[PDB]
């Protein structure tokens, strides 16, 4: 793309592209060696009978940074490759390539840290294909729309008004398969405040659009679906993973949704106790190469 009135602050670029303002986080790179070592350890702990998958995905700057900013942004692909190369008996899912094929579509937000749910769908699709439980067509889902979404880029750009003045449209999708969600604390105790609440879609004001998916991160969510195929998935994620969850409901009998930052148990025992068959680690590059990955060691792998 071609850019106009580009300004950098706080590691972000605010720039106009084809008449719309974007906030894009610039990337510095990283080998992800710690992350890969932690995943490898997790896999050793759960053993051969549990398939462990890795899907590290880029942020928008991998695809949409305009011409002339190459010197300010490292390759997301290179970090994703480095991680893949260091994995041992963990199945790598090429989410990067899946997204790259759909960049003409509205797969990323302009004003938020996260992809749009459409982007998450393509990544979920890549995983589900590898896992041999492919997703249904997006036309089978009920489409919902939130207008006037100004995401995290407003704060991250130190409240640049250009971001607030060019909101996204946030489009999400409700799957066709019946399910029931149960909300738990981070030590997997049923959360008594939410005993009667069983949807993964939570009503939010427009600013909270991304929090439509399970309301936030400091919890564990168990999802039981009408697809009784014996496949039981545990997802260990950062906030990018939140938007993938709706796209797994059609494909798995049970889904456990856990955040690597907020987990107060020993993950290998959690897998064993709940009969988990498949584990997905999914997060953006910044999380996998940075401090968030340490949550795998400090939270998931701590007894």
What does the model show?
The protein is an alpha/beta fold. It has one domain. Helices cover 25% and strands 24% of the residues. The chain contains 10 helices and 12 strands. The strands form 3 sheets. Strands 5-4-12-10-11-9-8 form a 7-stranded mixed beta sheet. Strands 1-2-3 form a 3-stranded antiparallel beta sheet. Strand 1 and strand 2 form a beta hairpin. Helix 1 packs parallel to helix 3 and helix 1 packs parallel to helix 10. The longest helix is centred in the N-terminal third of the chain and has 14 residues. The N and C termini lie far apart (48 Å).
SS class: alpha/beta
Instruction: Compute the separation of the termini in Å.
Output: 48 Å
Strands, count: 12
In terms of DSSP E residues, the strand content is 15-25%
Query: So what's the overall shape?
Result: globular
How are the strands of the biggest sheet laid out side by side? Answer: 5-4-12-10-11-9-8
The count of domains is 1
Number of helices: 10
* Series of H and E elements: EEEHEHHEHHEHHEEEEEHEHH
Q: Which percent range fits the helix content?
A: 25-40%
Radius of gyration: 19 Å
How does the major sheet shape up? 7 strands, mixed
Protein name: AlgX/AlgJ SGNH hydrolase-like domain-containing protein
Keywords: Signal
